[PDB]
Amino acid sequence: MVNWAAVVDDFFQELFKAHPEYQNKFGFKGVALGSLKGNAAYKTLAGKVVDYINAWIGGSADAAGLASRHKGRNVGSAEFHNAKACLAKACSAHGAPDLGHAIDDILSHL
């Protein structure tokens, strides 16, 4: 398998390194990056992102719904363009397929 859990962990390391302020929107606001994996709010959230990736791969991803929910948190195109870059790094680091098309689908609804 691809270890998508590991890809997602590196995604968040990249994301919050480049944009620490994005972490303020989550239940793990203020938690040291190096300790995120031990945080309960983070574990649940990371699991859902993994689920979304597996839903995209499996053909059931709802990009319109995901976009709508993110707009509902005042998260928009600029943030998802930054996420796209961080996710490409995380995928590359693990020899995982690029997920750019999945992010482009979300971006099309933003």
Measured between alpha carbons, how far is 77 from 45 in angstroms, rounded to an integer? 20
Measured between alpha carbons, how far is 107 from 64 in angstroms, rounded to an integer? 9
The binder of ligand HEM chosen from 2, 5, 6, 22 (CB under 6 A): 22
Question: How many residues interact with ligand HEM (rule CB under 6 A)?
Answer: 18
Asked if residue 69 binds ligand HEM (CB under 6 A), the reply is yes
Asked if residue 97 binds ligand HEM (CB under 6 A), the reply is no
Asked if residue 52 binds ligand HEM (CB under 6 A), the reply is yes
Measured between alpha carbons, how far is 44 from 83 in angstroms, rounded to an integer? 19
Measured between alpha carbons, how far is 82 from 86 in angstroms, rounded to an integer? 6
Give contact residues for ligand HEM (rule: CB under 6 A).
22, 25-27, 45, 48-49, 52, 66, 69-70, 73, 75, 79-80, 83, 87, 103
